[PDB]
């Protein structure tokens, strides 16, 4: 804040408050960031031990131990990196499909833009994108 660094050179890490989480660099971040699939603390220590922890009442938990907002469960999009938010929920149409024919459906029960079939990355977490029988 002042160009001689006199405001920071002598400083000791501050104690974290009731809704904060602490990182081995002695940093404080919001608890919500913990296990959110992003390395908010550079050592990825905010994503540690996630499988044994429970989740916030507003958030769904993925098989990988990670939390995602519950409104994004069963929405057709893979919000969990493991697609466990979509893998599990009930049938969506009398057709028995999980995805409209305007789009593409993959065994992860994930629904994907049709043009994505067979281009570079597997847009379906593992459900047979880029397979030659699609290409």
């Amino acid at each position: 804040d002042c160009g001689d660094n006199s405001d920071e050179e002598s400083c000791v890490p501050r104690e974290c408050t009731e809704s904060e989480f602490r990182c081995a660099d002695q940093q404080c971040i919001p608890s919500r960031w913990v296990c959110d699939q992003e390395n908010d603390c550079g050592d990825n220590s905010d994503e540690r031990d996630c499988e044994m922890k429970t989740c916030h009442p507003e958030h769904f938990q993925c098989t990988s131990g990670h939390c995602v907002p519950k409104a994004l469960a069963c929405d057709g999009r893979a919000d969990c990196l493991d697609a466990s938010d979509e893998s599990a929920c009930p049938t969506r149409f009398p057709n028995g499909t999980y995805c409209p024919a305007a789009m593409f459906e993959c065994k992860n029960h994930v629904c994907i833009q049709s043009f994505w079939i067979c281009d570079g990355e597997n847009d379906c977490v593992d459900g047979s994108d880029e397979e030659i029988h699609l290409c």
Partner: protein
């Protein structure tokens, strides 16, 4: 050989000479007016300028040295180096199991620190008991233990078939099956930078050190049920811990803040300084009459007499990446000790003084009303691939079926 009695100062009693520290190398036997001393099974006695030695049967001992990117072997008999494992990074700790499968290859367990966003690991490899080098390349297996940050303390239990480890940034002590299937947290509270861990299966006890704001050395039951602090005063940075099983189950530790090596009994009742000006010691190991320790600032291995007697010698100069020294020999850990467990436990059986107890992996719990069965799924053992076993300098290649197969030197023949 006799001292006056306190009950009657006009009478004479026999001193237990075996109660003196450093009286003999391995074992002492009291006699009324005298003492006798002997080496235990597997050891022999030999004359030397300083008296009787105890020297061990079997192929001569070796030293295992983990650098940051390689694990390397040194042979005290031949005074030479051999190449075991390479192309790794951030290795920290080592421990070995001598004959887990009867074949002539030991198994080695080593820990890897987190590099960044990527987490650490515990890894598993085969170590030939016989002479070998880069002719027998080593494959690696990973136990799959997720979320490790700084697993700077590792121990292996050969009776219960378990692996124990300490992580300074999770602030926990954890036990798992020796292939990584079931995982349990034994000590979760009042830890600050746990640094080193050792196990005694005969006593059913585990020992560990803390290096943080309040340095302490602690002992517990291998199932975690009982906990105690053996030393708290004058401990600085206690960074390495070793156990002597022949000199009455005794504990040694190294401190780099005070440049000292100290010894206590497993109950804390007798404390001694063995080596001062130890040059910032970072790891310890003990074999026969000798104590080996590593110096961190300048990469050296030093040896002295474990009772503090005499003088200290410099055995090796190995670069500053050196983190530990381990002694590799059949008689370091008593392979004969028998497991108390009786196959009642569904997931884990853990040792305690005089017996065993059953444990469930983390997050699971015992089925209602049971003490031996858990609400968790069974995991099948993870057996690792066959290693390159070519003995007499032969060289190994992986065939189209990926099986290792050997080619001999002109002087030898055979499948391996």
């Amino acid at each position: 050989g006799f001292k006056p009695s306190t009950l009657d100062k006009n009478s004479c009693q026999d001193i237990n000479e075996c109660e003196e520290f450093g009286i003999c190398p391995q074992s002492c036997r009291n006699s009324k007016g005298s003492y006798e001393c002997f080496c235990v099974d597997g050891f022999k006695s030999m004359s030397t300028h300083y008296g009787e030695r105890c020297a061990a049967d079997g192929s001569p001992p070796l030293l295992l040295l983990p650098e940051n990117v390689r694990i390397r072997k040194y042979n005290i008999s031949s005074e030479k180096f051999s190449e075991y494992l390479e192309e790794e990074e951030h290795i920290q700790a080592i421990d070995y199991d001598w004959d887990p499968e009867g074949i002539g290859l030991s198994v080695v367990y080593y820990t890897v620190l987190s590099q960044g966003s990527q987490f650490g690991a515990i890894k598993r490899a085969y170590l030939p008991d016989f002479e070998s080098g880069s002719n027998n390349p080593v494959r690696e297996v990973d136990l799959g233990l997720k979320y490790l940050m700084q697993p700077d303390g590792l121990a292996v239990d050969w009776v219960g078939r378990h692996i124990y480890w300490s992580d300074a940034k999770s602030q926990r002590i954890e036990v798992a099956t020796l292939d990584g299937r079931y995982r349990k947290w034994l000590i979760t509270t009042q830890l600050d930078q746990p640094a080193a861990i050792a196990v005694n299966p005969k006593l059913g006890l585990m020992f560990w050190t803390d290096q943080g704001k309040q340095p302490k050395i602690e002992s517990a039951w291998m199932n975690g049920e009982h906990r105690s602090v053996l030393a708290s005063a004058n401990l600085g940075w206690p960074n390495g811990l070793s156990i002597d099983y022949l000199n009455g189950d005794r504990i040694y530790w190294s401190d780099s803040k005070e440049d000292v090596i100290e010894s206590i009994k497993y109950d804390g009742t007798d404390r001694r300084l063995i080596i001062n000006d130890a040059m910032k010691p970072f790891s310890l190991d003990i074999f026969e009459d000798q104590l080996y320790w590593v110096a961190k600032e300048k990469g050296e291995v030093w040896r002295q007499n474990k009772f503090g007697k005499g003088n200290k010698e410099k055995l090796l100069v190995v670069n500053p990446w050196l983190t530990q020294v381990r002694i590799f020999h059949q008689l370091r850990y008593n392979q004969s000790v028998s497991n108390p467990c009786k196959q009642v436990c569904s997931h884990l059986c853990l040792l305690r003084p005089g017996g065993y107890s059953c444990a469930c992996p983390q997050g699971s719990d015992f089925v209602t009303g049971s003490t031996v069965e858990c609400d968790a799924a069974s995991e099948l053992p993870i057996t690792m691939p066959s290693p390159c076993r070519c003995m007499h300098g032969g060289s190994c290649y992986f065939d189209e079926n990926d099986l290792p197969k050997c080619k001999c030197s002109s002087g030898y023949s055979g499948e391996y």
